[PDB]
Design an enzyme around this catalytic site. Structure first.
Site, PDB file in Angstrom:
ATOM      1  N   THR A 195       5.240   6.540  -4.299  1.00  0.00           N
ATOM      2  CA  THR A 195       5.058   7.266  -3.036  1.00  0.00           C
ATOM      3  C   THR A 195       4.393   6.502  -1.922  1.00  0.00           C
ATOM      4  O   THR A 195       4.934   6.416  -0.794  1.00  0.00           O
ATOM      5  CB  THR A 195       4.214   8.482  -3.284  1.00  0.00           C
TER       6      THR A 195
ATOM      7  N   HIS B 198       8.289  15.125 -12.559  1.00  0.00           N
ATOM      8  CA  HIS B 198       7.412  14.543 -13.578  1.00  0.00           C
ATOM      9  C   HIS B 198       7.255  15.432 -14.817  1.00  0.00           C
ATOM     10  O   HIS B 198       7.256  14.948 -15.951  1.00  0.00           O
ATOM     11  CB  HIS B 198       6.023  14.268 -13.016  1.00  0.00           C
TER      12      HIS B 198
ATOM     13  N   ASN C 292       7.215 -16.466   0.753  1.00  0.00           N
ATOM     14  CA  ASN C 292       7.082 -15.476   1.817  1.00  0.00           C
ATOM     15  C   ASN C 292       8.449 -14.980   2.340  1.00  0.00           C
ATOM     16  O   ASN C 292       8.501 -14.233   3.296  1.00  0.00           O
ATOM     17  CB  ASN C 292       6.195 -15.995   2.968  1.00  0.00           C
TER      18      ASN C 292
ATOM     19  N   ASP D 131      11.169 -22.506   4.469  1.00  0.00           N
ATOM     20  CA  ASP D 131      10.013 -23.409   4.466  1.00  0.00           C
ATOM     21  C   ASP D 131      10.189 -24.474   5.558  1.00  0.00           C
ATOM     22  O   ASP D 131      11.300 -24.939   5.827  1.00  0.00           O
ATOM     23  CB  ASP D 131       9.913 -24.177   3.147  1.00  0.00           C
TER      24      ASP D 131
HETATM   25  C1  LIG Z   1       8.917  -8.607   7.760  1.00  0.00           C
HETATM   26  O1  LIG Z   1       8.456  -8.353   9.097  1.00  0.00           O
HETATM   27  C2  LIG Z   1       7.146  -8.826   9.317  1.00  0.00           C
HETATM   28  C3  LIG Z   1       6.713  -8.404  10.714  1.00  0.00           C
HETATM   29  O2  LIG Z   1       7.426  -9.149  11.676  1.00  0.00           O
HETATM   30  C4  LIG Z   1       7.017 -10.334   9.096  1.00  0.00           C
HETATM   31  O3  LIG Z   1       5.643 -10.566   8.944  1.00  0.00           O
HETATM   32  C5  LIG Z   1       5.078 -11.447   9.913  1.00  0.00           C
HETATM   33  O4  LIG Z   1       5.349 -12.797   9.665  1.00  0.00           O
HETATM   34  C6  LIG Z   1       4.851 -13.596  10.727  1.00  0.00           C
HETATM   35  C7  LIG Z   1       5.309 -15.035  10.556  1.00  0.00           C
HETATM   36  O5  LIG Z   1       4.900 -15.556   9.311  1.00  0.00           O
HETATM   37  C8  LIG Z   1       3.331 -13.495  10.837  1.00  0.00           C
HETATM   38  O6  LIG Z   1       2.983 -14.232  11.984  1.00  0.00           O
HETATM   39  C9  LIG Z   1       1.671 -14.799  11.850  1.00  0.00           C
HETATM   40  O7  LIG Z   1       0.727 -14.008  12.517  1.00  0.00           O
HETATM   41  C10 LIG Z   1      -0.576 -14.480  12.258  1.00  0.00           C
HETATM   42  C11 LIG Z   1      -1.566 -13.432  12.739  1.00  0.00           C
HETATM   43  O8  LIG Z   1      -1.210 -12.190  12.165  1.00  0.00           O
HETATM   44  C12 LIG Z   1      -2.295 -11.260  12.329  1.00  0.00           C
HETATM   45  O9  LIG Z   1      -2.118 -10.463  13.486  1.00  0.00           O
HETATM   46  C13 LIG Z   1      -0.889  -9.761  13.460  1.00  0.00           C
HETATM   47  C14 LIG Z   1      -0.654  -9.038  14.783  1.00  0.00           C
HETATM   48  O10 LIG Z   1      -1.655  -8.067  15.004  1.00  0.00           O
HETATM   49  C15 LIG Z   1      -0.872  -8.775  12.291  1.00  0.00           C
HETATM   50  O11 LIG Z   1       0.363  -8.088  12.247  1.00  0.00           O
HETATM   51  C16 LIG Z   1      -1.103  -9.506  10.974  1.00  0.00           C
HETATM   52  O12 LIG Z   1      -1.176  -8.548   9.921  1.00  0.00           O
HETATM   53  C17 LIG Z   1      -1.255  -9.205   8.639  1.00  0.00           C
HETATM   54  O13 LIG Z   1      -2.601  -9.435   8.275  1.00  0.00           O
HETATM   55  C18 LIG Z   1      -3.358  -8.249   8.304  1.00  0.00           C
HETATM   56  C19 LIG Z   1      -4.842  -8.558   8.086  1.00  0.00           C
HETATM   57  O14 LIG Z   1      -5.030  -9.285   6.888  1.00  0.00           O
HETATM   58  C20 LIG Z   1      -2.821  -7.273   7.253  1.00  0.00           C
HETATM   59  O15 LIG Z   1      -3.502  -6.051   7.340  1.00  0.00           O
HETATM   60  C21 LIG Z   1      -1.339  -6.998   7.462  1.00  0.00           C
HETATM   61  O16 LIG Z   1      -0.883  -6.251   6.348  1.00  0.00           O
HETATM   62  C22 LIG Z   1      -0.599  -8.329   7.566  1.00  0.00           C
HETATM   63  O17 LIG Z   1      -0.615  -8.983   6.311  1.00  0.00           O
HETATM   64  C23 LIG Z   1       0.686  -9.551   6.014  1.00  0.00           C
HETATM   65  O18 LIG Z   1       0.976 -10.743   6.731  1.00  0.00           O
HETATM   66  C24 LIG Z   1       0.093 -11.822   6.465  1.00  0.00           C
HETATM   67  C25 LIG Z   1       0.474 -13.026   7.334  1.00  0.00           C
HETATM   68  O19 LIG Z   1      -0.035 -12.830   8.644  1.00  0.00           O
HETATM   69  C26 LIG Z   1       0.120 -12.160   4.973  1.00  0.00           C
HETATM   70  O20 LIG Z   1      -0.866 -13.132   4.682  1.00  0.00           O
HETATM   71  C27 LIG Z   1      -0.184 -10.917   4.141  1.00  0.00           C
HETATM   72  O21 LIG Z   1      -0.039 -11.189   2.760  1.00  0.00           O
HETATM   73  C28 LIG Z   1       0.774  -9.806   4.513  1.00  0.00           C
HETATM   74  O22 LIG Z   1       2.061 -10.199   4.108  1.00  0.00           O
HETATM   75  C29 LIG Z   1      -2.380 -10.345  11.105  1.00  0.00           C
HETATM   76  O23 LIG Z   1      -3.493  -9.494  11.258  1.00  0.00           O
HETATM   77  C30 LIG Z   1      -0.762 -15.822  12.966  1.00  0.00           C
HETATM   78  O24 LIG Z   1      -2.057 -16.332  12.721  1.00  0.00           O
HETATM   79  C31 LIG Z   1       0.279 -16.825  12.481  1.00  0.00           C
HETATM   80  O25 LIG Z   1       0.248 -17.971  13.315  1.00  0.00           O
HETATM   81  C32 LIG Z   1       1.675 -16.194  12.480  1.00  0.00           C
HETATM   82  O26 LIG Z   1       2.135 -16.069  13.810  1.00  0.00           O
HETATM   83  C33 LIG Z   1       2.906 -12.039  11.013  1.00  0.00           C
HETATM   84  O27 LIG Z   1       1.506 -11.842  10.967  1.00  0.00           O
HETATM   85  C34 LIG Z   1       3.582 -11.144   9.970  1.00  0.00           C
HETATM   86  N1  LIG Z   1       3.425  -9.739  10.317  1.00  0.00           N
HETATM   87  C35 LIG Z   1       3.095  -8.775   9.441  1.00  0.00           C
HETATM   88  C36 LIG Z   1       2.584  -7.484  10.005  1.00  0.00           C
HETATM   89  O28 LIG Z   1       3.174  -8.884   8.216  1.00  0.00           O
HETATM   90  C37 LIG Z   1       7.648 -10.799   7.780  1.00  0.00           C
HETATM   91  O29 LIG Z   1       7.832 -12.209   7.789  1.00  0.00           O
HETATM   92  C38 LIG Z   1       9.010 -10.130   7.577  1.00  0.00           C
HETATM   93  N2  LIG Z   1       9.580 -10.533   6.294  1.00  0.00           N
HETATM   94  C39 LIG Z   1      10.781 -11.091   6.139  1.00  0.00           C
HETATM   95  C40 LIG Z   1      11.142 -11.498   4.742  1.00  0.00           C
HETATM   96  O30 LIG Z   1      11.580 -11.310   7.061  1.00  0.00           O
HETATM   97  C1  LIG Z   2       7.978   8.213   8.938  1.00  0.00           C
HETATM   98  C2  LIG Z   2       6.945   8.768   7.960  1.00  0.00           C
HETATM   99  C3  LIG Z   2       7.522   9.310   6.805  1.00  0.00           C
HETATM  100  C4  LIG Z   2       6.958  10.457   6.223  1.00  0.00           C
HETATM  101  C5  LIG Z   2       5.830  11.058   6.787  1.00  0.00           C
HETATM  102  C6  LIG Z   2       4.833  11.263   5.836  1.00  0.00           C
HETATM  103  C7  LIG Z   2       3.848  10.299   5.686  1.00  0.00           C
HETATM  104  C8  LIG Z   2       3.764   9.108   6.419  1.00  0.00           C
HETATM  105  C9  LIG Z   2       2.676   8.612   5.750  1.00  0.00           C
HETATM  106  C10 LIG Z   2       2.453   7.348   5.269  1.00  0.00           C
HETATM  107  C11 LIG Z   2       1.202   7.259   4.643  1.00  0.00           C
HETATM  108  C12 LIG Z   2       1.387   8.345   3.544  1.00  0.00           C
HETATM  109  C13 LIG Z   2       0.322   8.484   2.442  1.00  0.00           C
HETATM  110  C14 LIG Z   2       0.550   9.591   1.362  1.00  0.00           C
HETATM  111  C15 LIG Z   2       0.492  11.110   1.650  1.00  0.00           C
HETATM  112  C16 LIG Z   2       0.918  11.766   0.319  1.00  0.00           C
HETATM  113  C17 LIG Z   2       0.099  11.310  -0.899  1.00  0.00           C
HETATM  114  C18 LIG Z   2       0.785  12.009  -2.059  1.00  0.00           C
HETATM  115  O1  LIG Z   2       0.742  13.238  -2.097  1.00  0.00           O
HETATM  116  O2  LIG Z   2       1.063  11.367  -3.213  1.00  0.00           O
HETATM  117  C19 LIG Z   2       1.715  12.363  -4.053  1.00  0.00           C
HETATM  118  C20 LIG Z   2       1.808  11.831  -5.450  1.00  0.00           C
HETATM  119  O3  LIG Z   2       2.958  12.602  -5.834  1.00  0.00           O
HETATM  120  C21 LIG Z   2       2.395  10.447  -5.512  1.00  0.00           C
HETATM  121  O4  LIG Z   2       2.262   9.974  -6.851  1.00  0.00           O
HETATM  122  P1  LIG Z   2       3.549   9.228  -7.425  1.00  0.00           P
HETATM  123  O5  LIG Z   2       4.162   8.109  -6.414  1.00  0.00           O
HETATM  124  O6  LIG Z   2       4.523  10.385  -7.261  1.00  0.00           O
HETATM  125  O7  LIG Z   2       3.362   8.759  -8.830  1.00  0.00           O
HETATM  126 CA   LIG Z   3       8.619 -19.954   2.897  1.00  0.00          CA
HETATM  127 ZN   LIG Z   4       6.706  10.093  -4.169  1.00  0.00          ZN
HETATM  128 ZN   LIG Z   5       5.925  10.924  -8.553  1.00  0.00          ZN
END
Ligand SMILES: *[C@@H]1O[C@H](CO)[C@@H](O[C@@H]2O[C@H](CO)[C@@H](O[C@@H]3O[C@H](CO[C@H]4O[C@H](CO)[C@@H](O)[C@H](O[C@H]5O[C@H](CO)[C@@H](O)[C@H](O)[C@@H]5O[C@H]5O[C@H](CO)[C@@H](O)[C@H](O)[C@@H]5O)[C@@H]4O)[C@@H](O)[C@H](O)[C@@H]3O)[C@H](O)[C@H]2NC(C)=O)[C@H](O)[C@H]1NC(C)=O
Ligand SMILES: CC/C=C\C/C=C\C/C=C/CCCCCCCC(=O)OC[C@@H](O)COP(=O)(O)O
Ligand SMILES: [Ca+2]
Ligand SMILES: [Zn+2]
Ligand SMILES: [Zn+2]
Ligand SMILES: *[C@@H]1O[C@H](CO)[C@@H](O[C@@H]2O[C@H](CO)[C@@H](O)[C@H](O)[C@H]2NC(C)=O)[C@H](O)[C@H]1NC(C)=O
Ligand SMILES: *[C@@H]1O[C@H](CO)[C@@H](O[C@@H]2O[C@H](CO)[C@@H](O)[C@H](O)[C@H]2NC(C)=O)[C@H](O)[C@H]1NC(C)=O
Ligand SMILES: [K+]
Ligand code: NA
Length: 782
Positions: free
Chosen positions: A159, A265, A666, A670
């Protein structure tokens, strides 16, 4: 500190955000201990239930009632949803004929059609087959609107990862909610379904639809509902918000139901007990639609009916125990069930021995009902590796089974398995002015929906993993006009420039209209800065990289009647320099001769050369790639048996094959610095995977090379590994295991594009939107 002494008088489910010290009256309050003292009393009324009865019509308004049937209820926006049917002789929405909605029919003051997302938990796609006998409201939405036969969830098929994927358009590895439970080694903290830690924003990445809406000045209703708030109240609340003043009313709304998951379930997906919860959900859809009709909004709003994942038959009797394979399971923590993630019980415990663990879990029982993977080895289509919260060691579990740590019933259903598994597929229906009328669309992935929801609200989506335009065919209007990515690197077309004498590679060989036959959809565009050469051949064409010393892509066509021929023994080790490409930009056979582990293979197979003369081209050094012998078992079977089998079956096929480098797992191409393995003593880089994209005419009566209409594509991303430990039957003949491996590593063309920086299908007779749909297709083999 929050001052609970205040009152929710005239504040119930107010949309305005309220921080301390004042008390709240919204959904998050019960959940946050910030409710005013009279929240439950004033805001969660239950008196007299949820339906008007004849004896209530025209009543004097009692503010104690859950909903109202008094004469003023309508302008007050708080009638029970069945008020007009019972009191004013109107019909239920479901009883009204279906009628095409060509343009929004909205009341005064509505500027755009609101969007209501009605999400249902654990709604298996196949439940829709129960039809109007069980679910008449939903059946009307399905039959009269736009529906897919199913929608593919993301892995793991639980979920939290899926609902947040719906909200963001992102894979879990990118949004961060990689499971219902997870451990973050940097936070040193644990996220659980239950408990308050999940409320901390640090867990939640990307930009969910409600934030995207708000940042662009579009108002959103709640996307969170407290478990204590009954479904009927959720519906009444949405209807109340839709009755608000023009300057308060939201544009986007969400409803969530924990059914039919809970019942799935308990009883399993095929239980007779599943009928009741399905009827109950339909009743709720009916309340919504009746309520909308009461507000004259039933031909104004766009409604999405959407599930998070399906449900499989899973019982106590089908549980694998790790204690049967490992000596000390008390020392590991397992995220268990329909998937496995393993880490030491004590974080960073130095005695953790992952190689020994994996060895003890690999092909140890004939009927083994899971398979261990280091996360980098998981099928790339799962996109499940690039996040620190995903443990290195993963278990992919067989459908219908559980994995548990040790043996130390009340459930018959579960989900979480590989997202291509049929039982895991879920539902999508779109109904309203912006959706098409009585239209079926092919299945698609839930990552695509965020873009479409932004389209429906006139929002610009944050960067995400959907492919914007790939779902334009679901919509009557509000479609997104995609634009072709511009090519970054133009190719060289090198003519002859060298003599055989110019080459010292260690290689020995002891004996138009190419683009027309072999590049049916245009050359792939290179979307990064690099240096490469087009090379033409009678049997194939390639984009040879002067940097990575091998083709980025090799393209060729095989006719239905094509002949399969051997490699003559005197050519077994034949490799030939290519006088079009400098000796300095070529591989050398010496490195292979010397590397005791790595062999080589060819992108265009000599087995499929058009003539004995032509065969010699296949042996060029520019067609050669580094392949472990283990991989060669797979690749040769593919080149020699399978490509032909496909051509015979599909009336010819066009094939584009090539290398992929993703050492940092990722999912993206590369750069040079990121490549970590080379052929021994050389600078020849070793691909982590090899891809192949196999295209033909959707109309199989037409040959691949003369196709007038839509295309058919299947693709793969095969892991390049030094052993076949993944394939438990690999001791046998390739005919007993190779295709099974390939099916597990099926892929979308889009996946390959991310991993290669190439852009495919740029010269076709189809629309760009159609091609985007084609590129997102996944052949599942289910
Ligand atoms: C699916 O689509 C996404 C979105 O476009 C792509 O993900 C992006 O990839 C690019 C290029 O590699 C990254 O660019 C880098 O950006 C960083 C800075 O990034 C920071 O700020 C941005 C903007 O606010 C933010 O979105 C980023 O968020 C990441 O980190 C957060 C804090 O830890 C975390 O909460 C969030 O979940 C996210 O984590 C994910 O991405 C990071 C890599 O940044 C990775 O380590 C982690 O495991 C997660 O996968 C972050 O705060 C710059 O410093 C670099 O120079 C570079 O420009 C984007 O950040 C990244 N965006 C997101 C949101 O993931 C995927 O590539 C794409 N996948 C495919 C297969 O196509
Ligand atoms: C565009 C958004 C799509 C739907 C809107 C609803 C939520 C958007 C929210 C994203 C963050 C949601 C976080 C969860 C709220 C429900 C939590 C929940 O009730 O879990 C039920 C439980 O059974 C899941 O256990 P399971 O996966 O079934 O083993
Ligand atoms: Ca790569
Ligand atoms: Zn579910
Ligand atoms: Zn379930
Ligand atoms: C918490 O809220 C209560 C209720 O609003 C506050 O009580 C009021 O306080 C003011 C300030 O002295 C008085 O004039 C009112 O007579 C009180 N109203 C009622 C109806 O009780 C209380 O002050 C708050 N606690 C704080 C502010 O710390
Ligand atoms: C992997 O499995 C083997 C058994 O197949 C385990 O070795 C056993 O356990 C203890 C300690 O190693 C020995 O005293 C037993 O004699 C071994 N049993 C057998 C049947 O040979 C080994 O411990 C397992 N490894 C892990 C990491 O769990
Ligand atoms: K070798
Ligand atoms: Na094996």
């Amino acid at each position: 500190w929050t001052n609970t002494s205040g009152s929710c008088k005239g504040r119930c489910f107010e949309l305005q955000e309220v921080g301390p010290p004042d008390c709240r009256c919204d959904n998050l309050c019960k959940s946050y201990s910030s409710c005013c003292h009279d929240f439950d009393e004033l805001c969660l009324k239950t008196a007299r239930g949820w339906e008007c009865t004849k004896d209530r019509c025209g009543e004097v308004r009692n503010e104690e009632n859950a909903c109202h049937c008094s004469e003023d209820c309508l302008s007050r926006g708080d009638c029970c949803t069945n008020y007009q049917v019972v009191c004013k002789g109107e019909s239920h929405w479901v009883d009204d004929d279906c009628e095409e909605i060509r343009v929004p029919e909205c009341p005064a003051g509505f500027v755009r059609p609101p969007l209501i997302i009605f999400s249902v938990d654990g709604f298996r796609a196949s439940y829709m087959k129960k039809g109007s006998k069980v679910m008449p409201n939903i059946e009307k939405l399905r039959s009269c609107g736009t529906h897919a036969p199913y929608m593919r969830p993301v892995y793991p098929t639980k979920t939290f990862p899926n609902l947040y994927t719906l909200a963001t358009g992102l894979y879990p590895e990118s949004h961060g909610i990689v499971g219902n439970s997870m451990y973050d080694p940097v936070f040193d903290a644990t996220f659980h379904l239950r408990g308050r830690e999940k409320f901390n924003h640090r867990w939640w990445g990307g930009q969910p639809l409600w934030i995207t809406a708000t940042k662009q000045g579009v108002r959103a209703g709640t996307f969170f509902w407290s478990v204590s708030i009954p479904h009927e109240r959720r519906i009444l609340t949405i209807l109340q918000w839709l009755s608000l003043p023009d300057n308060e009313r939201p544009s986007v709304y969400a409803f969530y139901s924990e059914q039919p998951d809970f019942s799935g379930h308990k009883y399993g997906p095929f239980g007779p007990e599943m009928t009741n919860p399905l009827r109950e959900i339909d009743k709720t859809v009916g309340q919504l639609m009746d309520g909308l009709k009461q507000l004259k909004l039933h031909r104004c709003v766009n409604v999405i009916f959407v599930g998070d994942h399906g449900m499989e038959d899973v019982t106590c009797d089908r549980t694998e125990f790790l204690s049967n394979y490992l000596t000390n399971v008390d020392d590991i923590t397992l995220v268990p069930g329909t998937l496995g993630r393993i880490r030491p019980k004590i974080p960073n415990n130095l005695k953790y021995d992952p190689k020994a663990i994996i060895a003890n879990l690999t092909c140890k029982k004939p009927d083994q009902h899971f398979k261990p993977y280091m996360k980098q080895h998981l099928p790339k289509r799962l996109h499940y590796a690039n996040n620190r919260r995903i443990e290195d060691l993963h278990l992919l579990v067989e459908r219908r089974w559980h994995v548990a740590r040790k043996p130390l019933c009340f459930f018959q259903g579960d989900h979480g398995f590989d997202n291509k598994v049929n039982s895991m597929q879920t539902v999508f229906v779109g109904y309203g002015p912006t959706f098409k009328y009585r239209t079926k669309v092919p299945p698609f992935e839930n990552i695509e929906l965020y873009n479409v929801m932004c389209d429906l609200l006139g929002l610009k989506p944050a960067p995400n993993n959907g492919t914007h335009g790939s779902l334009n065919h679901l919509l009557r209007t509000n479609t997104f006009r995609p634009t072709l990515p511009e090519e970054v690197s133009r190719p060289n077309y090198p003519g002859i420039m060298y003599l055989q004498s110019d080459f010292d590679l260690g290689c020995t060989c002891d004996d138009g209209s190419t683009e027309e036959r072999h590049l049916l959809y245009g050359r792939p565009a290179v979307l990064y800065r690099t240096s490469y050469d087009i090379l033409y051949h009678t049997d194939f064409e390639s984009g040879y990289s002067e940097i990575f010393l091998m083709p980025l892509w090799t393209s060729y066509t095989i006719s239905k009647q094509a002949e399969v021929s051997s490699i003559p023994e005197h050519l077994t080790n034949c490799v030939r320099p290519d006088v079009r490409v400098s000796p300095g930009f070529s591989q050398n056979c010496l490195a292979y001769k010397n590397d005791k582990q790595m062999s080589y293979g060819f992108l265009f197979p000599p087995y499929l050369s058009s003539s004995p003369e032509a065969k010699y081209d296949a042996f060029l050094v520019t067609n050669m790639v580094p392949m472990y012998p283990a991989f060669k078992r797979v690749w040769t079977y593919f080149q020699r048996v399978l490509v032909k089998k496909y051509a015979s079956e599909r009336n010819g096929v066009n094939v584009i094959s090539g290398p992929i480098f993703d050492y940092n797992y990722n999912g993206l191409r590369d750069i040079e610095d990121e490549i970590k393995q080379y052929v021994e003593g050389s600078s020849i880089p070793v691909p982590t995977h090899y891809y192949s994209i196999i295209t033909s005419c959707l109309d199989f009566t037409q040959p691949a090379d003369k196709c007038d209409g839509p295309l058919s594509v299947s693709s793969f991303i095969l892991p390049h590994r030094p052993d076949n430990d993944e394939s438990c039957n690999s001791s046998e003949d390739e005919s007993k295991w190779v295709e099974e491996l390939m099916k597990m590593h099926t892929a979308r063309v889009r996946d390959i594009e991310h991993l290669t920086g190439l852009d495919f299908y740029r010269k076709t007779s189809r629309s760009y939107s159609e091609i985007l749909t084609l590129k997102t297709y996944l052949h599942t083999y289910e």
